[PDB]
């Protein structure tokens, strides 16, 4: 949770707006509260015994999700260490035979056992992810949909852009009975109906949201409670096909779930060919935090890197055109005079030759093509070689190096800016630390006791958990504002000290 | 109370009610109110 | 002191004491603090380079074995991807130090059924190992200075 | 240098008003005061 808070503060300070700061903070608080509920749920304390055992097993997997991932990485490293002892031969231990070359003779059984363990651990990782992190994904999706419905009329007064796939897919869940399954607000449909019923028609809204006013009224008037005994048939009738389809679409669009599924698929392919287990070594990028940061350095300017490679390709193509038109005779790469091996006898071949050999040459294409001394085109061709070396080898590779170095510098600067902001001004009210430090450690006391972010999140959790009939006056005020998504109750440029400066002094 | 009554008119004309501040002839800061055209507003919003 | 004592056993152990310039000279200490500022990241970068080169070794061992003959006389071949350990050593030792990568050292693929696959192999090796990862090391040192 | 110039532009636009040059701290004495000042009181688009 501390890591989540750090990431949230970084994101808000770096790519956040002042107007949306409190909206982002409240969304972060809601996500943290839901994660806390999940953590409490999974924390540890014939059909019934089987059910309780299944729940305990799933809770164990969710608790040890990260340990399972580290175990998978360790197993992959062990498998690849064993694979380092692999050898090829012509005779059993035209056709070529691959086999382990080990003296002790224990490596082949160990490899098979480790591969089986790795596949099992990958499957367990998938299950643990589904039980631990998918709920938050569904919660965020559902709450965003509910807010868009209530405060934007995203399917009432306006429609999805039709290029945004998320809105089109979300259209599937509107009328499902269990649409708000993870998001705690169970009155979303009623709120939307009361908000947009008059302008766009109560019947139309009810049809869109899959609710029946006549049934609501009849249930209110009288009570009928037919409850069949629990059973497989009852459960099957209970399941909600449309909602499950929408949920599985969301899950299969989730990035981390896709990565874990690919991990499992590669683990399965490892049993077809052991060398497919080498793909799992790529997991160090996701697993090790230092490596993840280093690689974020590279991916920070990834678009610019790709465009730079494209520009290099275009420039090399221009050089290829010039060579194909004027310097064809210098591209013979054959020593025997009987059989020439020309490279600029066709444009495709010469472009391949340039991009493949000249770019990798230390001095450029001149390192590889024939020496031009004593030729009518000697000066033209030395200019050709020198400009190739300067523009391709020196300038463009310098651009790539500079992009990586600038990514490092930019990330460092962003971290420093976040730290400076958090040390200089209060995250909530925005008042500078100089005003608060008029009293000893005033800013520290203000950020620890007066405008504490954790305290605001705890208050939100307490308000949500408390029954509305028990709210005090202030709690009712804040609850109403929270329901309306009005963040004016958050102090902004004001505090208790400023409010009562005269009396407090 | 008057503003509450006129809320609908004010809401309708909000995008077209431009206001600026100038140092006026009275040697004081003054607020000037004027009309913005819909075509001008759309052109300003154009991405280029 | 221990190295000084060993210097009497063999005079060349006194060469170890030249390493003391790092501790003694303030300018050198600052310059080397530049390198050690991101030492953990440098070590992890070397590890990532090792892993990437291992993946390239796996691909070469599985598909490009015939291009790794480093013998001129036809009677006695000297293959490098005839076993994974040998070919991983060959990659990490020769390809990383080659200016253009492993393509500088392994056989020319012109006129082969796998020519395009193998030129992609060489070009990606050059780009990811020689250009990017070394650029990462240089950038770590420069960022330490900054 | 280009990155630094962009950052300086962003910091200036977030810290002081482009027209009057008064810092955002004075305006933020009221809730979202600087935002309201730059959106309604001293709006560049409104001057144009
Ligand atoms: C998140 C990133 C997403 C992208 C990941 C890309 C992963 C790369 C690979 C493969 C594509 C997946 C689907 C391929 C399945 C084809 C099936 C196949 O393959 O069947 C042909 C042979 C199988 O073997 P066999 O015929 O001898 O029969 C063995 C047993 N019997 C004798 C029963 C007959 O294939 C072989 O041998 C395979 C030999 C081993 C090949 C090297 C393993 C991959 C290792 C490193 C490459 C890393 C690339 C990373 C991508 C860039 C991301 C930045
Ligand atoms: C980021 C920058 C990208 C760089 C792009 C590529 C840079 C490559 C640079 C330099 C090469 C310099 C030498 C170019 C020409 C030398 C040959 C020459 O001079 O022979 C005189 C010819 C004789 O004709 P012919 O009978 O032999 O063939 C006629 C018909 N055919 C051609 C198929 C049979 O006269 C003629 O044809 C006249 C034909 C018109 C000449 C067009 C050449 C334009 C190329 C580059 C301009 C700038 C290069 C110098 C500055 C460096 C770049 C900054
Ligand atoms: C605080 C940081 C610590 C990191 C540095 C640690 C130091 C690394 C080195 C050595 C540890 C030695 C421990 C074992 C020594 C056993 C003795 C031995 O070894 O006796 C074998 C031969 C001696 O000669 P002999 O048999 O002819 O007997 C001649 C006399 N009679 C004629 C009696 C027969 O050994 C020889 O010859 C030795 C020839 C000289 C070898 C080069 C000396 C070191 C020079 C440069 C490298 C410095 C290391 C820097 C790397 C880390 C920096 C980050
Ligand atoms: C940071 C990133 C790290 C980079 C990781 C290393 C990337 C190295 C990249 C590229 C090399 C491209 C060429 C790879 C394959 C060419 C060979 C081919 O095409 O032969 C087709 C075969 C024919 O079957 P066969 O008769 O030879 O039996 C094979 C049974 N055995 C294997 C023991 C005898 O079909 C098959 O086996 C199908 C087998 C499945 C293919 C697995 C190879 C996948 C390797 C890399 C992923 C994509 C590379 C391009 C992306 C650039 C990197 C970003
Ligand atoms: Zn505060
Ligand atoms: Zn102003």
PDB file of N, CA and C and ligand atoms in Angstrom, chain C residues 2-3 6 8-17 19 23, ligand 3:
ATOM      1  N   UNK C   2      49.079  -6.897   4.285  1.00  0.00           N
ATOM      2  CA  UNK C   2      49.229  -8.282   3.848  1.00  0.00           C
ATOM      3  C   UNK C   2      49.833  -8.336   2.452  1.00  0.00           C
ATOM      4  N   UNK C   3      49.365  -7.470   1.552  1.00  0.00           N
ATOM      5  CA  UNK C   3      49.934  -7.429   0.209  1.00  0.00           C
ATOM      6  C   UNK C   3      51.386  -6.972   0.246  1.00  0.00           C
ATOM      7  N   UNK C   6      53.322  -9.999   1.177  1.00  0.00           N
ATOM      8  CA  UNK C   6      53.407 -10.915   0.045  1.00  0.00           C
ATOM      9  C   UNK C   6      54.368 -10.400  -1.017  1.00  0.00           C
ATOM     10  N   UNK C   8      57.253  -9.454  -0.598  1.00  0.00           N
ATOM     11  CA  UNK C   8      58.560 -10.044  -0.342  1.00  0.00           C
ATOM     12  C   UNK C   8      58.630 -11.483  -0.828  1.00  0.00           C
ATOM     13  N   UNK C   9      57.493 -12.177  -0.863  1.00  0.00           N
ATOM     14  CA  UNK C   9      57.450 -13.497  -1.479  1.00  0.00           C
ATOM     15  C   UNK C   9      57.586 -13.387  -2.992  1.00  0.00           C
ATOM     16  N   UNK C  10      56.842 -12.465  -3.599  1.00  0.00           N
ATOM     17  CA  UNK C  10      56.953 -12.181  -5.026  1.00  0.00           C
ATOM     18  C   UNK C  10      56.829 -10.680  -5.218  1.00  0.00           C
ATOM     19  N   UNK C  11      57.839 -10.072  -5.844  1.00  0.00           N
ATOM     20  CA  UNK C  11      57.879  -8.616  -5.932  1.00  0.00           C
ATOM     21  C   UNK C  11      56.659  -8.053  -6.646  1.00  0.00           C
ATOM     22  N   UNK C  12      56.049  -8.823  -7.545  1.00  0.00           N
ATOM     23  CA  UNK C  12      54.953  -8.293  -8.343  1.00  0.00           C
ATOM     24  C   UNK C  12      53.675  -8.099  -7.544  1.00  0.00           C
ATOM     25  N   UNK C  13      53.585  -8.652  -6.334  1.00  0.00           N
ATOM     26  CA  UNK C  13      52.441  -8.356  -5.484  1.00  0.00           C
ATOM     27  C   UNK C  13      52.407  -6.893  -5.073  1.00  0.00           C
ATOM     28  N   UNK C  14      53.525  -6.179  -5.201  1.00  0.00           N
ATOM     29  CA  UNK C  14      53.536  -4.751  -4.919  1.00  0.00           C
ATOM     30  C   UNK C  14      52.736  -3.952  -5.936  1.00  0.00           C
ATOM     31  N   UNK C  15      52.371  -4.552  -7.068  1.00  0.00           N
ATOM     32  CA  UNK C  15      51.534  -3.853  -8.034  1.00  0.00           C
ATOM     33  C   UNK C  15      50.138  -3.607  -7.484  1.00  0.00           C
ATOM     34  N   UNK C  16      49.678  -4.453  -6.561  1.00  0.00           N
ATOM     35  CA  UNK C  16      48.353  -4.267  -5.985  1.00  0.00           C
ATOM     36  C   UNK C  16      48.243  -2.937  -5.254  1.00  0.00           C
ATOM     37  N   UNK C  17      49.353  -2.430  -4.726  1.00  0.00           N
ATOM     38  CA  UNK C  17      49.335  -1.189  -3.964  1.00  0.00           C
ATOM     39  C   UNK C  17      49.119   0.040  -4.833  1.00  0.00           C
ATOM     40  N   UNK C  19      46.601   0.332  -6.628  1.00  0.00           N
ATOM     41  CA  UNK C  19      45.169   0.567  -6.506  1.00  0.00           C
ATOM     42  C   UNK C  19      44.855   1.608  -5.444  1.00  0.00           C
ATOM     43  N   UNK C  23      41.838   5.571  -3.331  1.00  0.00           N
ATOM     44  CA  UNK C  23      41.565   6.076  -1.991  1.00  0.00           C
ATOM     45  C   UNK C  23      42.345   7.352  -1.698  1.00  0.00           C
TER      46      UNK C  23
HETATM   47  C1  LIG E   3      40.707  -4.419  -0.981  1.00  0.00           C
HETATM   48  C2  LIG E   3      40.445  -4.941  -2.412  1.00  0.00           C
HETATM   49  C3  LIG E   3      41.040  -6.368  -2.571  1.00  0.00           C
HETATM   50  C4  LIG E   3      40.973  -6.774  -4.071  1.00  0.00           C
HETATM   51  C5  LIG E   3      42.388  -7.163  -4.599  1.00  0.00           C
HETATM   52  C6  LIG E   3      42.854  -8.534  -4.026  1.00  0.00           C
HETATM   53  C7  LIG E   3      44.286  -8.835  -4.575  1.00  0.00           C
HETATM   54  C8  LIG E   3      44.244  -9.913  -5.699  1.00  0.00           C
HETATM   55  C9  LIG E   3      45.423 -10.929  -5.562  1.00  0.00           C
HETATM   56  C10 LIG E   3      46.100 -11.935  -4.980  1.00  0.00           C
HETATM   57  C11 LIG E   3      45.708 -12.735  -3.715  1.00  0.00           C
HETATM   58  C12 LIG E   3      46.874 -13.719  -3.374  1.00  0.00           C
HETATM   59  C13 LIG E   3      46.411 -14.775  -2.322  1.00  0.00           C
HETATM   60  C14 LIG E   3      47.196 -16.107  -2.555  1.00  0.00           C
HETATM   61  C15 LIG E   3      48.732 -15.833  -2.594  1.00  0.00           C
HETATM   62  C16 LIG E   3      49.496 -17.186  -2.479  1.00  0.00           C
HETATM   63  C17 LIG E   3      51.013 -16.963  -2.749  1.00  0.00           C
HETATM   64  C18 LIG E   3      51.267 -17.005  -4.277  1.00  0.00           C
HETATM   65  O1  LIG E   3      50.431 -16.616  -5.023  1.00  0.00           O
HETATM   66  O2  LIG E   3      52.496 -17.501  -4.777  1.00  0.00           O
HETATM   67  C19 LIG E   3      52.456 -18.050  -6.085  1.00  0.00           C
HETATM   68  C20 LIG E   3      53.095 -17.068  -7.075  1.00  0.00           C
HETATM   69  C21 LIG E   3      54.380 -16.510  -6.440  1.00  0.00           C
HETATM   70  O3  LIG E   3      55.427 -16.514  -7.383  1.00  0.00           O
HETATM   71  P1  LIG E   3      56.528 -17.760  -7.312  1.00  0.00           P
HETATM   72  O4  LIG E   3      55.783 -19.078  -7.312  1.00  0.00           O
HETATM   73  O5  LIG E   3      57.442 -17.697  -8.513  1.00  0.00           O
HETATM   74  O6  LIG E   3      57.431 -17.642  -5.913  1.00  0.00           O
HETATM   75  C22 LIG E   3      58.575 -16.795  -5.898  1.00  0.00           C
HETATM   76  C23 LIG E   3      59.451 -17.118  -4.635  1.00  0.00           C
HETATM   77  N1  LIG E   3      60.020 -18.508  -4.654  1.00  0.00           N
HETATM   78  C24 LIG E   3      61.060 -18.377  -5.720  1.00  0.00           C
HETATM   79  C25 LIG E   3      60.003 -18.697  -3.178  1.00  0.00           C
HETATM   80  C26 LIG E   3      59.630 -19.917  -4.977  1.00  0.00           C
HETATM   81  O7  LIG E   3      52.188 -16.042  -7.354  1.00  0.00           O
HETATM   82  C27 LIG E   3      52.654 -15.010  -8.208  1.00  0.00           C
HETATM   83  O8  LIG E   3      53.583 -15.185  -8.926  1.00  0.00           O
HETATM   84  C28 LIG E   3      51.931 -13.641  -8.185  1.00  0.00           C
HETATM   85  C29 LIG E   3      52.354 -12.751  -9.375  1.00  0.00           C
HETATM   86  C30 LIG E   3      51.702 -11.354  -9.185  1.00  0.00           C
HETATM   87  C31 LIG E   3      50.200 -11.427  -9.544  1.00  0.00           C
HETATM   88  C32 LIG E   3      49.648  -9.997  -9.780  1.00  0.00           C
HETATM   89  C33 LIG E   3      49.539  -9.257  -8.427  1.00  0.00           C
HETATM   90  C34 LIG E   3      48.260  -8.386  -8.411  1.00  0.00           C
HETATM   91  C35 LIG E   3      48.390  -7.303  -9.500  1.00  0.00           C
HETATM   92  C36 LIG E   3      47.339  -6.777 -10.135  1.00  0.00           C
HETATM   93  C37 LIG E   3      45.879  -7.190  -9.850  1.00  0.00           C
HETATM   94  C38 LIG E   3      45.375  -6.502  -8.553  1.00  0.00           C
HETATM   95  C39 LIG E   3      43.969  -7.068  -8.197  1.00  0.00           C
HETATM   96  C40 LIG E   3      42.860  -6.015  -8.495  1.00  0.00           C
HETATM   97  C41 LIG E   3      41.499  -6.721  -8.785  1.00  0.00           C
HETATM   98  C42 LIG E   3      40.378  -6.203  -7.834  1.00  0.00           C
HETATM   99  C43 LIG E   3      40.239  -4.658  -7.953  1.00  0.00           C
HETATM  100  C44 LIG E   3      38.752  -4.219  -7.964  1.00  0.00           C
END
